[PDB]
C-alpha cells in the first residue's frame with residue numbers, strides 16, 4: 001500500500017514556469033516549444049515493490065519502472081541519459097536525476113484531489129498540476 005494515493009491515471013491541468021525549468025535543464029528551443037504544448041497523461045501503477053510511471057502525450061510516450069531507493073538508468077523525454085533514484089520522503093515521491101555533473105529533482109505529492117509535480121533545477125521551479133483523468 002506503498003503509494004496507494006498516487007496510483008491511477010492523471011491528466012495535466014495547469015503549468016507554471018515549465019519553459020524556464022526546461023531552459024535551465026538545457027533543453028533546446030524546438031523541443032521546449034513542442035514539449036511545452038503537451039498535455040500529458042501520467043499513469044502510475046504498483047506491482048509488489050515495482051512502481052511504474054508512464055507519461056503519454058502527443059510529444060512523447062515514456063515509461064519508467066523502479067524500486068524505491070534503487071538507482072536506474074532513464075532516457076528523458078528530451079533525450080538526456082540520466083541516472084535516477086526515486087524515494088519516498090514523508091509521503092512525497094522524490095525523483096533525483098544526475099547527468100553530466102548536473103542534477104534536477106522532481107517531487108510528486110498528493111494535495112486534495114490533485115497530484116502536484118514540482119520540478120527544480122538550480123533556482124528555478126516549475127509546478128505542474130494533474131487531476132484524475
Ligand SMILES: N#Cc1cccc(Nc2ccccc2C(=O)O)c1
Nearest residue numbers: 022031035040076077078106117128
Ligand atoms: N521534453 C521534456 C521534459 C523535460 C523535463 C521534464 C519533463 N516532464 C515531466 C517530468 C517529470 C514529471 C512530470 C513532467 C511533466 O511533464 O509534468 C519533460
